[PDB]
Structures are given as structure tokens and as C-alpha cells.
Amino acid sequence: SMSVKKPKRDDSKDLALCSMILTEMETHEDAWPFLLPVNLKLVPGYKKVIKKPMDFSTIREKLSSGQYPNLETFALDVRLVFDNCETFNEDDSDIGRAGHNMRKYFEKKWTDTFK
């Protein structure tokens, strides 16, 4: 509350660490569905069904240009990429499997880096 602060967690390496995690996701072999925005002219249903499209390149731009206020807002966008995938793709599809694999990969790196 006013003049009463919890001890200061060092957040000064978070930008760099999130960049590193993002790099590891960009270079995973199953990142291909997620590297670029879905082409909303060429994929029927995508625009209407997926209210908040997200992809790795868009996340990379936001990170590089100070559009994440903190590491939680970063993790929200990465989870959004995998939540969207689950919404639009059957679990038993190559894309659907890719998404489950990537989410598992992300969450481990996130826990190990910050928890």
C-alpha cells in the first residue's frame, strides 16, 4: 500500500531472457505453423473465429519495440498463439500436435528461467 512496498525483484534481465526463449521457440522444428501471421484472405473462418490472432514474428516485433510492459504480458501473447491453435485445429492433426508440443516446450523454459 502507500509507502509500504514488497522487496524489489530484479527484473533487469527479463527482456534478454524473453528474447532468448523466443529464439529457442522460433528455431524449434515444429514452430512452422506459428512463425508468421495466418493469411486471413486465404484461410476460411480464421478472421471470424479467432478474435485475437498472434504469431512468433508479431511477438518478436512487440518485444523489440517496447510494447511488453512486463514478462507476464509477454507470456500471455505466447500462450495466445497456442490457445488459438487449439481453437482452430484438431488435436490429431499435424498443426494441432505442433501446438501441444510447443506449449509444453515453452512452459518448461518459462519455469526453469523464472520460477
| Helicity range | 55-70%
The shape, in one word, is elongated
Please, how many domains?
A: 1
Q: What would you call the structural class?
A: mainly alpha
CATH architecture: Up-down Bundle
Measured on Cα atoms, how large is the radius of gyration? 16 Å
The span between the termini is: 25 Å
The CATH class assignment is Mainly Alpha
Q: Please write the string of helix (H) and strand (E) elements.
A: HHHHH
CATH H level, superfamily name: Bromodomain-like
In short:
By secondary structure, this protein is an all-alpha fold. The chain has helices at residues 14-26, 46-49, 56-64, 71-88, 94-114.
List keywords for this structure.
Bromodomain adjacent to zinc finger domain protein 2B; 57% helix; 0% strand; Histone Acetyltransferase, Chain A; mainly alpha; PanDDA; dna binding protein; 115 residues
Give an overview in words.
With 115 residues, this protein is mainly alpha-helical. It has a single domain, classed as Histone Acetyltransferase, Chain A, CATH 1.20.920.10. It is 57% helix and 0% strand. It is built from five helices and no strands. The longest helix is centred in the C-terminal third of the chain and has 21 residues. 16% of the residues are buried. It comes from Homo sapiens (Human). This is Bromodomain adjacent to zinc finger domain protein 2B. It is found in: Nucleus.
Secondary structure layout plus pairing:
Blueprint lengths: L13 H13 L19 H4 L6 H9 L6 H18 L5 H21 L1
Helix pairs in contact: 1-3, 4-5
Family: Belongs to the WAL family.
Subcellular location: Nucleus
Organism: Homo sapiens (Human)
